[PDB]
Amino acid sequence: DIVLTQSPATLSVSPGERATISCRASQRVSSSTYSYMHWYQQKPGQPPKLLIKYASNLESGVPARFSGSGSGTDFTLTISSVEPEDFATYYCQHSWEXPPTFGGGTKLEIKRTVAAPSVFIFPPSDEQLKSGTASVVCLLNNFYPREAKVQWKVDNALQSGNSQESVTEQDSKDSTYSLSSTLTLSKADYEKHKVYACEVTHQGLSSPVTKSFNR
Amino acid sequence: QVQLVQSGAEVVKPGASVKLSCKASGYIFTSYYMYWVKQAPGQGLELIGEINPSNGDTNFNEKFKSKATLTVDKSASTAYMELSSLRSEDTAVYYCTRSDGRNDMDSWGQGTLVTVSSASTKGPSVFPLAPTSGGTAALGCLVKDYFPEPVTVSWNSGALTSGVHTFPAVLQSSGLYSLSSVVTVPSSSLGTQTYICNVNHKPSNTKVDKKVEPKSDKTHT
């Protein structure tokens, strides 16, 4: 088969800067007259989406800031000015011959301005505690960049395990991340303590920030 | 509007079969080729094959010609893909997609996650994360103890999307998944607005709505 090699694997651009991503076919996929390379955008959680067909034809409804060029083996997708909602993986695909094959993807990442997390804490619902378990959720909302350190403190003691974290992809509207950290305890353990605290360290903050509740 | 709507996520036992469907609407079904495409988790795209729904001509990526059977029901505007004797490597999102002339693929299904596993499906419990920072409040739903992926969440049947963050699942020690979906809103309007999270776990046929109300107590016994 024909191998499409995309580059780079990851592209980071600032808000409103130009983004260029390349796709090299292992052999020619153009005639005298037309090119058989197509470009797609896969936004997080969604199917791929057609942007550009036949190397340079902008698909209908696709914003004007997208464009494509090249012939033969070397093809490029240009975004003239990157917006938050352009956060996606971009895939090339040929239809020169059987079987159509896809490139490996270029992840486009957006270097937006530094933002500290707003931090919130949720005690366990009464509903959950009826069942014998207590999840305490600590939320770090709308921060940039990604690196953030979260630590749980129960009665001022550093908790060593029993928590799990998950971070979002970059947000489609403001390019920030959010993170949830959930501390899971049995109802008994939960109730044998008073203070539940989450301590957040992030480079947009000059000190650690602590949200807590007493039960 | 053109639309391709795929069947729900499913767990399949190793060595079993599964039949995926793709319902087409807003155009004449037999006027476009239909492709099936495989996306392995955290991975890129592979073509499974092509069916011509007018004349049934198929064309398979050689790699899948022993794995996949493509059919259609023209009377019902629906393409099917049957995947045979599944193993771990078949765990993936499967997309149907259309193509007017076998070049670009201009409309896509939303995808079906097939997870190959011996573990039983399990539906999640949904718990409120009841509602401050710079005059904003956070609220959410904790969606706990489900297998396999995926769970989807919307807020207020899709009317509430601004500020929503629905986290990637985490894998718990039990081997069951967990996720939270949260939103930030004005703290000022917590007593006037209604926030309901809609949780869908297609594999267990779980479709659950949970009103998240403000945490509203002087007495401690």
Coordinates of N, CA and C in Angstrom, one line a residue, chain B residues 25-158:
Chain B
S25 N -29.9 8.9 6.3 CA -31.0 9.7 6.0 C -30.7 11.1 5.4
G26 N -31.7 11.7 4.8 CA -31.6 13.0 4.1 C -31.0 13.0 2.8
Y27 N -30.8 11.8 2.2 CA -30.5 11.6 0.8 C -30.8 10.3 0.3
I28 N -30.6 10.0 -1.0 CA -31.0 8.7 -1.6 C -29.8 7.7 -1.3
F29 N -30.1 6.8 -0.4 CA -29.1 5.8 0.1 C -28.2 5.1 -1.0
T30 N -28.9 4.7 -2.1 CA -28.1 4.0 -3.1 C -27.3 4.9 -4.1
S31 N -27.4 6.2 -3.9 CA -26.6 7.1 -4.7 C -25.1 7.3 -4.2
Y32 N -24.7 6.7 -3.0 CA -23.4 7.0 -2.5 C -22.8 5.7 -2.0
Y33 N -21.4 5.6 -2.1 CA -20.7 4.5 -1.6 C -20.7 4.7 -0.2
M34 N -20.6 3.6 0.6 CA -20.4 3.6 2.0 C -19.1 2.9 2.3
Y35 N -18.3 3.6 3.1 CA -17.0 3.0 3.7 C -17.2 2.7 5.2
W36 N -16.5 1.7 5.6 CA -16.3 1.4 7.1 C -14.8 1.6 7.4
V37 N -14.6 2.3 8.5 CA -13.3 2.8 8.9 C -13.1 2.4 10.4
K38 N -11.9 2.1 10.8 CA -11.6 1.6 12.1 C -10.6 2.5 12.8
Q39 N -10.9 2.9 14.0 CA -9.9 3.7 14.7 C -9.6 3.1 16.1
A40 N -8.4 2.6 16.2 CA -8.0 2.0 17.4 C -7.9 3.0 18.5
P41 N -8.1 2.7 19.8 CA -8.1 3.7 20.8 C -6.7 4.4 20.9
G42 N -6.8 5.7 21.0 CA -5.7 6.6 21.0 C -4.8 6.5 19.8
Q43 N -5.5 6.2 18.6 CA -4.8 5.7 17.4 C -5.3 6.5 16.1
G44 N -4.7 6.2 14.9 CA -5.2 6.7 13.6 C -6.1 5.8 12.9
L45 N -6.3 6.1 11.6 CA -7.5 5.6 10.8 C -7.1 4.5 9.8
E46 N -7.9 3.5 9.7 CA -7.7 2.3 8.8 C -9.0 2.0 8.1
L47 N -8.9 1.8 6.8 CA -10.0 1.5 6.0 C -10.3 0.0 6.1
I48 N -11.5 -0.3 6.4 CA -11.9 -1.7 6.4 C -12.4 -2.1 5.0
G49 N -13.2 -1.3 4.4 CA -13.7 -1.6 3.1 C -14.9 -0.7 2.7
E50 N -15.3 -1.0 1.4 CA -16.3 -0.2 0.7 C -17.4 -1.1 0.2
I51 N -18.6 -0.6 0.4 CA -19.7 -1.2 -0.3 C -20.5 -0.3 -1.3
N52 N -20.8 -0.7 -2.5 CA -21.7 0.0 -3.4 C -23.1 -0.4 -3.1
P53 N -23.9 0.4 -2.5 CA -25.3 0.0 -2.1 C -26.3 -0.2 -3.2
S54 N -26.0 0.2 -4.5 CA -26.8 0.0 -5.6 C -26.7 -1.5 -6.1
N55 N -25.4 -1.9 -6.2 CA -25.1 -3.3 -6.8 C -24.4 -4.3 -5.9
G56 N -24.1 -3.9 -4.7 CA -23.6 -4.8 -3.7 C -22.1 -5.0 -3.8
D57 N -21.5 -4.5 -4.9 CA -20.0 -4.7 -5.1 C -19.3 -4.2 -3.8
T58 N -18.5 -5.0 -3.2 CA -17.6 -4.7 -2.1 C -16.2 -4.7 -2.5
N59 N -15.4 -4.0 -1.7 CA -13.9 -4.0 -1.9 C -13.3 -3.8 -0.5
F60 N -12.5 -4.7 -0.1 CA -12.0 -4.8 1.2 C -10.5 -4.5 1.2
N61 N -10.0 -3.7 2.2 CA -8.6 -3.7 2.5 C -8.2 -5.1 2.9
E62 N -7.3 -5.6 2.2 CA -6.9 -7.1 2.3 C -6.8 -7.5 3.7
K63 N -6.2 -6.7 4.5 CA -6.0 -6.9 6.0 C -7.2 -7.3 6.7
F64 N -8.4 -6.9 6.2 CA -9.7 -7.2 6.9 C -10.7 -8.1 6.1
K65 N -10.2 -8.7 5.0 CA -11.1 -9.4 4.2 C -11.6 -10.7 4.8
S66 N -11.0 -11.2 5.9 CA -11.5 -12.4 6.7 C -12.2 -12.0 8.0
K67 N -12.3 -10.7 8.2 CA -12.9 -10.1 9.5 C -14.2 -9.5 9.3
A68 N -14.5 -8.9 8.2 CA -15.6 -8.0 8.0 C -16.4 -8.5 6.8
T69 N -17.8 -8.4 7.0 CA -18.7 -8.7 5.9 C -19.6 -7.4 5.8
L70 N -19.6 -6.8 4.7 CA -20.4 -5.7 4.4 C -21.7 -6.1 3.7
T71 N -22.8 -5.6 4.3 CA -24.2 -5.7 3.6 C -24.9 -4.4 3.7
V72 N -26.1 -4.4 2.9 CA -27.0 -3.3 3.1 C -28.4 -3.8 3.0
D73 N -29.4 -3.0 3.6 CA -30.8 -3.3 3.4 C -31.3 -2.0 2.7
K74 N -31.4 -2.0 1.4 CA -31.8 -0.8 0.6 C -33.2 -0.3 1.0
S75 N -34.1 -1.3 1.2 CA -35.5 -0.8 1.6 C -35.4 0.0 2.9
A76 N -34.5 -0.2 3.8 CA -34.4 0.4 5.1 C -33.2 1.5 5.3
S77 N -32.5 1.8 4.2 CA -31.4 2.8 4.2 C -30.4 2.5 5.2
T78 N -29.9 1.3 5.3 CA -29.0 0.9 6.4 C -27.9 0.0 5.9
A79 N -26.6 0.4 6.3 CA -25.5 -0.4 5.9 C -25.1 -1.2 7.2
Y80 N -24.7 -2.4 7.0 CA -24.2 -3.2 8.1 C -22.8 -3.7 8.0
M81 N -22.1 -3.8 9.1 CA -20.8 -4.5 9.1 C -20.8 -5.6 10.2
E82 N -20.6 -6.8 9.8 CA -20.5 -7.9 10.7 C -19.0 -8.2 10.9
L83 N -18.5 -8.2 12.1 CA -17.1 -8.5 12.5 C -17.1 -9.9 13.1
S84 N -16.3 -10.8 12.6 CA -16.2 -12.2 13.0 C -15.1 -12.5 14.0
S85 N -15.3 -13.5 14.8 CA -14.4 -14.0 15.8 C -13.4 -13.0 16.4
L86 N -14.0 -12.1 17.2 CA -13.3 -11.0 17.7 C -12.2 -11.4 18.7
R87 N -11.1 -10.6 18.6 CA -10.0 -10.7 19.6 C -9.7 -9.2 20.1
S88 N -8.8 -9.1 21.0 CA -8.4 -7.8 21.6 C -8.1 -6.8 20.6
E89 N -7.4 -7.1 19.6 CA -7.0 -6.1 18.5 C -8.2 -5.5 17.7
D90 N -9.4 -6.2 17.9 CA -10.6 -5.6 17.3 C -11.2 -4.5 18.1
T91 N -10.8 -4.3 19.4 CA -11.3 -3.2 20.2 C -11.0 -1.9 19.5
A92 N -12.0 -1.1 19.2 CA -11.9 0.1 18.4 C -13.2 0.8 18.3
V93 N -13.1 2.0 17.9 CA -14.3 2.8 17.4 C -14.4 2.4 15.9
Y94 N -15.6 2.0 15.4 CA -15.9 1.8 14.0 C -16.8 2.9 13.5
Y95 N -16.4 3.5 12.4 CA -17.2 4.5 11.7 C -17.7 4.0 10.4
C96 N -18.9 4.3 10.1 CA -19.4 4.3 8.7 C -19.3 5.7 8.1
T97 N -19.1 5.8 6.8 CA -19.0 7.1 6.2 C -19.4 7.0 4.8
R98 N -19.9 8.1 4.2 CA -20.3 8.0 2.8 C -19.3 8.7 1.9
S99 N -19.4 8.4 0.6 CA -18.5 9.0 -0.5 C -19.3 9.0 -1.8
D100 N -19.5 10.2 -2.4 CA -20.2 10.3 -3.7 C -19.6 9.5 -4.9
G101 N -18.3 9.4 -4.9 CA -17.5 8.8 -6.0 C -16.2 8.2 -5.6
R102 N -16.2 7.5 -4.4 CA -15.0 6.8 -3.9 C -13.7 7.6 -3.7
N103 N -13.8 8.9 -3.6 CA -12.6 9.7 -3.2 C -12.7 10.2 -1.8
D104 N -13.1 11.4 -1.6 CA -13.4 12.0 -0.2 C -14.6 11.4 0.4
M105 N -14.6 11.3 1.8 CA -15.6 10.8 2.6 C -16.3 12.0 3.3
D106 N -17.5 12.4 2.8 CA -18.0 13.7 3.2 C -19.0 13.8 4.3
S107 N -19.4 12.6 4.8 CA -20.3 12.6 6.0 C -20.0 11.4 6.7
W108 N -20.0 11.5 8.1 CA -19.6 10.4 8.9 C -20.6 10.1 10.0
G109 N -20.7 8.8 10.3 CA -21.3 8.4 11.5 C -20.5 8.8 12.7
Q110 N -21.2 8.7 13.9 CA -20.6 9.2 15.1 C -19.7 8.1 15.8
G111 N -19.8 6.9 15.3 CA -18.9 5.8 15.6 C -19.5 4.9 16.6
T112 N -19.0 3.6 16.6 CA -19.4 2.6 17.5 C -18.2 2.0 18.1
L113 N -18.1 2.1 19.5 CA -17.0 1.5 20.2 C -17.3 0.0 20.5
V114 N -16.5 -0.9 19.9 CA -16.6 -2.3 20.2 C -15.5 -2.6 21.2
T115 N -15.8 -3.1 22.3 CA -14.7 -3.5 23.3 C -14.8 -5.0 23.4
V116 N -13.7 -5.7 23.1 CA -13.7 -7.1 23.2 C -13.3 -7.5 24.6
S117 N -14.2 -8.1 25.4 CA -13.9 -8.5 26.7 C -14.7 -9.7 27.2
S118 N -14.2 -10.4 28.2 CA -15.0 -11.4 28.9 C -15.8 -10.9 30.1
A119 N -15.4 -9.6 30.6 CA -16.1 -9.0 31.7 C -17.6 -8.6 31.3
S120 N -18.5 -8.6 32.3 CA -19.9 -8.2 32.0 C -20.0 -6.7 31.9
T121 N -21.0 -6.4 31.1 CA -21.4 -5.0 31.0 C -22.0 -4.6 32.4
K122 N -21.8 -3.3 32.7 CA -22.4 -2.7 33.9 C -22.7 -1.3 33.8
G123 N -23.9 -0.9 34.2 CA -24.4 0.5 34.1 C -24.0 1.3 35.3
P124 N -23.8 2.6 35.1 CA -23.3 3.4 36.2 C -24.3 3.9 37.2
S125 N -23.9 4.3 38.4 CA -24.7 5.2 39.3 C -24.3 6.6 39.0
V126 N -25.3 7.5 39.2 CA -25.0 8.9 39.0 C -25.3 9.7 40.2
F127 N -24.3 10.4 40.7 CA -24.4 11.1 41.9 C -24.2 12.6 41.7
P128 N -24.9 13.5 42.4 CA -24.8 14.9 42.2 C -23.5 15.5 42.7
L129 N -23.0 16.5 42.1 CA -21.9 17.3 42.7 C -22.5 18.6 42.8
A130 N -23.1 18.8 44.0 CA -24.0 20.0 44.2 C -23.2 21.3 44.4
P131 N -23.7 22.4 43.8 CA -23.0 23.7 44.0 C -23.1 24.2 45.4
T132 N -17.7 28.3 45.4 CA -17.6 29.5 44.6 C -16.2 30.3 44.5
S133 N -16.0 30.9 43.3 CA -14.7 31.5 42.9 C -15.1 32.6 41.9
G134 N -14.7 33.8 42.2 CA -14.9 35.0 41.4 C -16.4 35.2 41.0
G135 N -17.3 34.9 41.9 CA -18.8 34.9 41.7 C -19.3 33.8 40.8
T136 N -18.6 32.7 40.5 CA -19.1 31.6 39.7 C -19.2 30.4 40.6
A137 N -20.1 29.5 40.3 CA -20.3 28.3 41.0 C -20.0 27.1 40.1
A138 N -19.6 26.0 40.6 CA -19.4 24.8 39.9 C -20.3 23.8 40.4
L139 N -20.8 22.9 39.4 CA -21.7 21.8 39.7 C -21.4 20.7 38.8
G140 N -22.0 19.5 39.0 CA -21.6 18.4 38.2 C -22.3 17.1 38.5
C141 N -22.0 16.0 37.8 CA -22.5 14.7 38.0 C -21.3 13.7 38.1
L142 N -21.2 12.9 39.1 CA -20.2 11.8 39.2 C -20.9 10.6 38.6
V143 N -20.3 10.0 37.6 CA -20.8 8.8 36.9 C -19.9 7.7 37.2
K144 N -20.4 6.8 38.1 CA -19.5 5.9 38.8 C -19.9 4.4 38.5
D145 N -18.9 3.6 38.2 CA -18.9 2.1 38.2 C -19.6 1.5 37.0
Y146 N -19.0 1.8 35.8 CA -19.5 1.3 34.6 C -18.5 0.5 33.8
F147 N -19.0 -0.4 33.0 CA -18.1 -1.1 32.0 C -18.9 -1.5 30.8
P148 N -18.4 -1.5 29.6 CA -17.2 -0.9 29.2 C -17.4 0.6 28.9
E149 N -16.5 1.3 28.4 CA -16.7 2.7 27.8 C -17.7 2.5 26.6
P150 N -18.4 3.6 26.2 CA -18.3 4.9 26.7 C -19.6 5.3 27.5
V151 N -19.4 6.4 28.3 CA -20.6 7.1 28.9 C -20.5 8.4 28.2
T152 N -21.7 8.9 27.8 CA -21.8 10.3 27.4 C -22.6 11.1 28.3
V153 N -22.4 12.4 28.5 CA -23.2 13.3 29.3 C -23.6 14.5 28.5
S154 N -24.9 14.9 28.6 CA -25.2 16.2 28.2 C -25.8 16.9 29.4
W155 N -26.0 18.2 29.3 CA -26.7 19.0 30.3 C -27.9 19.7 29.8
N156 N -29.0 19.6 30.5 CA -30.3 20.1 30.1 C -30.6 19.8 28.7
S157 N -30.6 18.4 28.4 CA -30.9 17.9 27.0 C -30.2 18.5 25.9
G158 N -28.9 19.0 26.1 CA -28.1 19.6 25.1 C -28.2 21.2 25.1

